Amino acid sequence: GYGYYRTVIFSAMFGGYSLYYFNRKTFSFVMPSLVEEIPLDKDDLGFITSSQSAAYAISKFVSGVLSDQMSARWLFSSGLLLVGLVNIFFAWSSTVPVFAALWFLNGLAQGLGWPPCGKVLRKWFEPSQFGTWWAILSTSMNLAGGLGPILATILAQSYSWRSTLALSGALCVVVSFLCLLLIHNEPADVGLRNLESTLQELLLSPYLWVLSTGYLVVFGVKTCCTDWGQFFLIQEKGQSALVGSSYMSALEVGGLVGSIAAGYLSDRAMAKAGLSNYGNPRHGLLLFMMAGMTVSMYLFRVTVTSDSPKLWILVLGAVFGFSSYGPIALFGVIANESAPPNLCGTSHAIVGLMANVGGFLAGLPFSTIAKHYSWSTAFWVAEVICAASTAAFFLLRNIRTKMG
Amino acid sequence: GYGYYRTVIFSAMFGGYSLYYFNRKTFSFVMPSLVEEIPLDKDDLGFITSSQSAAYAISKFVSGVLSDQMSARWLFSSGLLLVGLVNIFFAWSSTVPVFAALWFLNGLAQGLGWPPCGKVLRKWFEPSQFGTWWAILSTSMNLAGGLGPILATILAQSYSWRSTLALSGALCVVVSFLCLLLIHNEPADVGLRNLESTLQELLLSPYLWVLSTGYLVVFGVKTCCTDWGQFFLIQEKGQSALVGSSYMSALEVGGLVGSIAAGYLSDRAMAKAGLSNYGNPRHGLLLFMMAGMTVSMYLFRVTVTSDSPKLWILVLGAVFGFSSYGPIALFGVIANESAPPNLCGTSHAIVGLMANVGGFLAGLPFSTIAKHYSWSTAFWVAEVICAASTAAFFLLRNIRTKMG
Ligand SMILES: CCCCCCCCCCC(CCCCCCCCCC)(CO[C@H]1O[C@@H](CO)[C@H](O[C@@H]2O[C@@H](CO)[C@H](O)[C@@H](O)[C@@H]2O)[C@@H](O)[C@@H]1O)CO[C@H]1O[C@@H](CO)[C@H](O[C@@H]2O[C@@H](CO)[C@H](O)[C@@H](O)[C@@H]2O)[C@@H](O)[C@H]1O
Ligand SMILES: CCCCCCCCCCC(CCCCCCCCCC)(CO[C@H]1O[C@@H](CO)[C@H](O[C@@H]2O[C@@H](CO)[C@H](O)[C@@H](O)[C@@H]2O)[C@@H](O)[C@@H]1O)CO[C@H]1O[C@@H](CO)[C@H](O[C@@H]2O[C@@H](CO)[C@H](O)[C@@H](O)[C@@H]2O)[C@@H](O)[C@H]1O
Ligand SMILES: CCCCCCCCCCC(CCCCCCCCCC)(CO[C@H]1O[C@@H](CO)[C@H](O[C@@H]2O[C@@H](CO)[C@H](O)[C@@H](O)[C@@H]2O)[C@@H](O)[C@@H]1O)CO[C@H]1O[C@@H](CO)[C@H](O[C@@H]2O[C@@H](CO)[C@H](O)[C@@H](O)[C@@H]2O)[C@@H](O)[C@H]1O
Ligand SMILES: CCCCCCCCCCC(CCCCCCCCCC)(CO[C@H]1O[C@@H](CO)[C@H](O[C@@H]2O[C@@H](CO)[C@H](O)[C@@H](O)[C@@H]2O)[C@@H](O)[C@@H]1O)CO[C@H]1O[C@@H](CO)[C@H](O[C@@H]2O[C@@H](CO)[C@H](O)[C@@H](O)[C@@H]2O)[C@@H](O)[C@H]1O
Numbered sequence: 001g002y003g004y005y006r007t008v009i010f011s012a013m014f015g016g017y018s019l020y021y022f023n024r025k026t027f028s029f030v031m032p033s034l035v036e037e038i039p040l041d042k043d044d045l046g047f048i049t050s051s052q053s054a055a056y057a058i059s060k061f062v063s064g065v066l067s068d069q070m071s072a073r074w075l076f077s078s079g080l081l082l083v084g085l086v087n088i089f090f091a092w093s094s095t096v097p098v099f100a101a102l103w104f105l106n107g108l109a110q111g112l113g114w115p116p117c118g119k120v121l122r123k124w125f126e127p128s129q130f131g132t133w134w135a136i137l138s139t140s141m142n143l144a145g146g147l148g149p150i151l152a153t154i155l156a157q158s159y160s161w162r163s164t165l166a167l168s169g170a171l172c173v174v175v176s177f178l179c180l181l182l183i184h185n186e187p188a189d190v191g192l193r194n195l196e197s198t199l200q201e202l203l204l205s206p207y208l209w210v211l212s213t214g215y216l217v218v219f220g221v222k223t224c225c226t227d228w229g230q231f232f233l234i235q236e237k238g239q240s241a242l243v244g245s246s247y248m249s250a251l252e253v254g255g256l257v258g259s260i261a262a263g264y265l266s267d268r269a270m271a272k273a274g275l276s277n278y279g280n281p282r283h284g285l286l287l288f289m290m291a292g293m294t295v296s297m298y299l300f301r302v303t304v305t306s307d308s309p310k311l312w313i314l315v316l317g318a319v320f321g322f323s324s325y326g327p328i329a330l331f332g333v334i335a336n337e338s339a340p341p342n343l344c345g346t347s348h349a350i351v352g353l354m355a356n357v358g359g360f361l362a363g364l365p366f367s368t369i370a371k372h373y374s375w376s377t378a379f380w381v382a383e384v385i386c387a388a389s390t391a392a393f394f395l396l397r398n399i400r401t402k403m404g
Numbered sequence: 405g406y407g408y409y410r411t412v413i414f415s416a417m418f419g420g421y422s423l424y425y426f427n428r429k430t431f432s433f434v435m436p437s438l439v440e441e442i443p444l445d446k447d448d449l450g451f452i453t454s455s456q457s458a459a460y461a462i463s464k465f466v467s468g469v470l471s472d473q474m475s476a477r478w479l480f481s482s483g484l485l486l487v488g489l490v491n492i493f494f495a496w497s498s499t500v501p502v503f504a505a506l507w508f509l510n511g512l513a514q515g516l517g518w519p520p521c522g523k524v525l526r527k528w529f530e531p532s533q534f535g536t537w538w539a540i541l542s543t544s545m546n547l548a549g550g551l552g553p554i555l556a557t558i559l560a561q562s563y564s565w566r567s568t569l570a571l572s573g574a575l576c577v578v579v580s581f582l583c584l585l586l587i588h589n590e591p592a593d594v595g596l597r598n599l600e601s602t603l604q605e606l607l608l609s610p611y612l613w614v615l616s617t618g619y620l621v622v623f624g625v626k627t628c629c630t631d632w633g634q635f636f637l638i639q640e641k642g643q644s645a646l647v648g649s650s651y652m653s654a655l656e657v658g659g660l661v662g663s664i665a666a667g668y669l670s671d672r673a674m675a676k677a678g679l680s681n682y683g684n685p686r687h688g689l690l691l692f693m694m695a696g697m698t699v700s701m702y703l704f705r706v707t708v709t710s711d712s713p714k715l716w717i718l719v720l721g722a723v724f725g726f727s728s729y730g731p732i733a734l735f736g737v738i739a740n741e742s743a744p745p746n747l748c749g750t751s752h753a754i755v756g757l758m759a760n761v762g763g764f765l766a767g768l769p770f771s772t773i774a775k776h777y778s779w780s781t782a783f784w785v786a787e788v789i790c791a792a793s794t795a796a797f798f799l800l801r802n803i804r805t806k807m808g
Contacts, residue, residue: 047772097773368451369501 002192005184009124010133012182013117016080017137018144019172020113023083025145026168027090027103029152033161044096048103055104057356059111064349068342072116077180079112084172091165115345118336122344123186124194128271131282131333135263138329142256197340197404205403207338208350210396214286215331215351216358217389221293222324223362224382226251229317232375238306239313246310247317254318255325262289262326263333279398280338286330287397290390292323297383301376340404347403406596409588413528414537416586417521420484421541422548423576424517427487429549430572431494431507433556437565448500452507459508461760463515468753472746476520481584483516488576495569519749522740526748527590528598532675535686535737539667542733546660601744601808609807611742612754614800618690619735619755620762621793625697626728627766628786630655633721636779642710643717650714651721658722659729666693666730667737683802684742690734691801694794696727701787705780744808751807 031045067075086106093099121133155164187194202208229251230244266282273281296319304313331351339347370378435449471479490510497503525537559568591598606612633655634648670686677685700723708717735755743751774782 044772047768096776097769100769100772364451365501365504368448368504372500 005187005190006124008182009120009184012179013120013137014140015175016076016179017113017117017140019080019175020083020110021141021144022148023087023168023172024106024110025148026087026152026165029148030156030161030164033156037161038094040096044099047096048100051100052103052107055107056110057107059108060114061111061349061353063112064115064345064352067115067119067345071185072119073180073183073185075112075116076183077176079109080172080176080179082109082112084169084176086169087165087172088169091162091169115348118348119344120183120185122336126194127337128267130337131263131267131270131329134333135260135329138259139256196342199343199346202340202343202346202403205400207399207401207403208335208347210393210399211331211335212351212354214389214393215328215335216354217386218290218293218324218327218331219355220358220362221297221382221386222328223359224366224379225297225320225324227362228366228370228375228378231370232379233304233313236375237304237308243310243313247313250314250317251321254321258289258322258324258326259329261322263329266330266333277402278400280334280401282330282334283397286327287390287394289323289326289330290386290393293320293327294383294387294390296320296323297379297386301379301383338401338403409591409594410528412586413524413588416583417524417541418544419579420480420583421517421521421544423484423579424487424514425545425548426552427491427572427576428510428514429552430491430556430569433552434560434565434568437560441565442498444500448503451500452504455504456507456511459511460514461511463512464518465515465753465757467516468519468749468756471519471523471749475589476523477584477587477589479516479520480587481580483513484576484580484583486513486516488573488580490573491569491576492573495566495573519752522752523748524587524589526740530598531741532671534741535667535671535674535733538737539664539733542663543660600746603747603750606744606747606750606807609804611803611805611807612739612751614797614803615735615739616755616758618793618797619732619739620758621790622694622697622728622731622735623759624762624766625701625786625790626732627763628770628783629701629724629728631766632770632774632779632782635774636783637708637717640779641708641712647714647717651717654718654721655725658725662693662726662728662730663733665726667733670734670737681806682804684738684805686734686738687801690731691794691798693727693730693734694790694797697724697731698787698791698794700724700727701783701790705783705787742805742807 027048034040063075083106086102086109090099090102090106093102117137118134121130121137125133152164184190226248229247233239233244233247234241262285266285269284270281275281296316300316300320304316332348335348335351336344366378366382369381431452438444467479487510490506490513494503494506494510497506521541522538525534525541529537556568588594630652633651637643637648637651638645666689670689673688674685679685700720704720704724708720736752739752739755740748770782770786773785
């Protein structure tokens with residue numbers, strides 16, 4: 001049955017992705033115990049995390065490019081097995097260089113997880129049910145990250161820090177075999193079906209670069225606000241050290257809610273509306289959320305004094321999180337849906353690369369501008385850039401959409 | 405006349421490239437005066453240099469890829485004009501963010517200089533005279549860098565720091581028009597001649613990846629030695645603070661001599677020997693210099709005690725510089741010569757990217773290994789890697805050379 005097969009594939013995917021993220025964050029989970037056992041300074045942890053991040057970025061781009069030439073099931077299982085083996089080996093090392101070398105292969109293996117999931121979802125689900133399940137897998141990753149630390153410390157205070165990593169690796173290996181056994185690549189491999197534009201022609205379309213610039217701006221603004229909102233609130237507004245934590249929590253909760261709601265409403269709008277070679281039914285929600293993000297930025301910058309109630313700050317944070325985390329999922333869904341049946345990964349790898357460079361831009365120059373002039377000037381610059389981007393995106397709404 | 409036209413093109417190229425490098429390094433040349441005028445801390449200078457370096461790397465790759473679709477003369481002149489304009493605008497600014505934003509466009513413009521020169525050299529010169537002139541252009545860059553500082557401080561102590569940059573920009577604009585007028589793209593544009601493998605077929609050849617890995621190892625080892633030789637000599641050998649400076653000077657001089665000699669001897673060997681689809685006449689010198697580099701590394705690591713004469717240290721530094729700076733030029737020449745008549749830039753951009761990642765590897769993990777274990781262990785690791793690479797390169801000598 002279609003429902004039975006979809007349920008089985010979805011359950012296996014959910015479990016695999018949750019284990020992926022747990023084993024990504026296990027070192028940060030268990031850091032205090034190994035710090036107590038073998039002392040480390042602040043440089044070693046940063047070096048290890050930096051190596052993992054660089055490996056993750058490079059692998060992610062490469063596996064996104066290559067995911068259209070190899071089977072999704074084998075890619076998923078191999079990545080999970082390598083992640084488990086790397087964790088098991090990490091459990092039996094006691095020197096920084098070996099730690100940092102083992103945490104690089106971890107990023108390389110982690111880069112292989114999502115593109116197979118995206119391809120299987122696209123080939124198994126109808127285009128009117130392809131933003132809901134995307135967001136639900138994102139929430140699977142969120143749930144794994146949220147439930148990680150509590151169980152991690154609960155288990156670590158009981159036995160040790162070395163046993164937890166080995167147990168996680170063994171569980172990853174077992175679940176890798178289970179997912180290999182359970183996941184099906186295509187409906188044709190069972191007896192159903194739910195249904196050429198070379199790379200040179202794909203790269204010669206303007207929609208790809210429009211989406212890349214949109215992702216640039218959205219990710220950069222989100223990173224700027226997430227990284228420096230507490231700093232702005234503490235050093236210029238005059239608030240305490242708990243209002244920042246509450247504002248971050250509200251931002252995260254509102255962002256999760258906004259991602260799910262954006263996916264569902266966009267899928268409903270696409271199902272309701274028709275299809276044509278020009279335009280996209282998913283653009284209205286994207287433009288609305290962009291405008292909401294800009295308005296919330298302006299309100300937070302201007303109408304938050306030293307005597308503002310805490311409820312107002314929480315409301316502003318929630319609204320910005322909603323309107324900033326919706327469009328990210330929308331771009332991720334669109335860059336893969338509005339592509340030929342092949343080259344889906346190659347239509348998303350470039351977008352991820354733009355996200356990385358936008359993160360670097362949100363990191364260094366924003367901080368130096370804030371240090372020199374002020375935080376108000378830096379946030380004003382970010383808001384002006386976002387408003388200009390939104391205006392350009394609205395001006396370029398009805399364009400050649402289907403690339404190829 | 406062939407000689408007259410070659411002389412004119414060579415002179416214009418030499419002048420253009422020398423001005424390119426002078427305007428690359430002018431800020432480092434004139435830094436003390438502007439530091440005295442407007443105080444700066446150590447973070448701002450690093451930020452500016454980092455922005456320029458990142459822009460240079462990205463532009464270099466992009467312009468190497470794109471240099472086969474646009475005219476070399478126009479690319480050269482446009483790059484020089486933009487460099488001059490950027491310097492002129494930099495002369496009229498007084499704040500760090502604007503400085504760092506203007507020093508990014510400088511890197512973007514600088515990335516456009518060399519690939520047009522390489523294409524013109526390949527299309528104008530015979531393959532038996534294409535390693536000598538390559539090395540001579542490299543020495544043009546070296547001469548510009550060497551004669552920069554003296555003239556820079558001599559002029560800066562006279563008038564100001566603001567006038568020097570404007571004068572350099574104006575000179576760059578004038579020389580840009582002169583080079584636009586003088587450089588000829590092809591011999592067919594005058595009435596002579598001195599004489600399809602798509603990118604997908606080009607990327608499916610093993611010679612490209614062999615060359616990429618060789619450049620990886622050579623550049624990484626050279627960067628390791630250049631960066632940490634003084635540290636090793638001072639903190640483990642027990643030598644003074646002037647022996648390191650002498651060792652660096654000997655390394656640089658020996659490297660320049662080795663680059664010129666390697667180019668000349670390799671061109672002579674290729675002219676003497678025949679041509680075939682398998683192998684390359686330029687491999688013997690490359691293997692010999694690789695072996696010399698490994699032997700010199702071992703001798704410097706082992707046979708240099710706290711009582712070694714300074715002449716021995718100078719000799720070892722000169723030999724390593726020779727044997728390390730030869731192969732870099734050899735790889736640069738080969739990756740462009742042993743390529744189809746098109747895609748020459750695309751056959752060198754990947755090699756440059758590998759050089760960048762090898763530089764990062766030589767930078768961070770080598771330093772952390774040296775900090776944890778010792779400098780001797782780090783240099784032993786580098787020497788072992790170089791020896792293994794040399795053995796693999798010798799084992800893979802006679803292979804499919806002409807890619808396509
Ligand atoms: C084989 C590949 C051949 C070509 C490679 C290209 C260039 C080679 C290296 C370039 C590159 C990978 C290449 C990107 C994709 C390549 C795809 C293009 C294919 C071309 C066909 C690594 O290179 C940089 O990586 C930095 C690590 O951040 C290092 O900083 C070190 O750590 C610093 C502490 O922050 C200190 O300053 C110091 O400790 C070091 O300085 C740099 O020294 C290093 O140069 C840049 O990638 C970028 O990815 C992203 C996400 O990871 C990173 O963003 C952030 O990283 C972490 C915070 O750092 C966060 O955790 C992460 O959340 C965040 O997102 C970037 O930072 C950067 O990593
Ligand atoms: C089919 C449906 C699927 C089910 C999904 C539902 C479950 C999702 C909730 C999980 C959730 C919400 C918590 C509110 C719950 C109420 C919400 C109402 C609805 C749910 C009922 C818990 O998130 C927090 O949970 C806390 C408790 O563990 C942790 O505190 C710890 O406690 C200490 C030890 O006690 C520790 O020592 C200490 O380290 C912590 O202080 C926090 O670290 C964690 O952020 C969010 O988690 C997820 O959000 C994302 C945001 O992007 C976050 O990713 C971030 O991305 C970057 C930013 O873009 C950041 O740069 C990056 O850093 C980060 O990776 C993560 O946070 C992720 O995990
Ligand atoms: C639109 C492009 C879309 C994709 C971009 C890819 C990823 C985006 C950013 C990745 C990338 C450019 C991309 C490489 C080529 C891309 C071609 C691939 C095309 C794919 C189809 C910049 O990204 C890094 O650049 C570093 C600058 O070094 C920054 O470090 C900052 O500064 C630090 C102080 O050293 C501090 O830690 C701190 O102040 C910051 O942390 C990092 O924060 C930053 O992440 C990494 O490139 C690399 O190039 C080389 C040579 O320049 C650099 O090596 C060195 O740099 C200087 C010493 O640094 C030296 O002067 C230079 O002599 C030396 O060689 C590398 O360092 C790196 O720059
Ligand atoms: C058709 C033929 C063409 C003619 C070519 C011949 C001319 C070439 C000679 C120029 C030469 C040799 C000097 C010995 C001369 C005898 C040699 C015998 C033959 C010649 C007769 C002078 O080189 C030095 O000259 C000194 C005097 O200016 C400078 O000291 C300054 O003084 C203070 C102010 O007084 C200043 O305040 C202070 O900053 C300095 O201390 C040094 O900065 C400079 O290095 C070498 O220059 C060139 O070498 C390359 C090496 O790769 C170097 O590039 C490096 O690459 C990276 C490393 O891979 C490095 O990381 C990177 O940092 C660097 O970019 C540069 O050095 C480059 O410029």
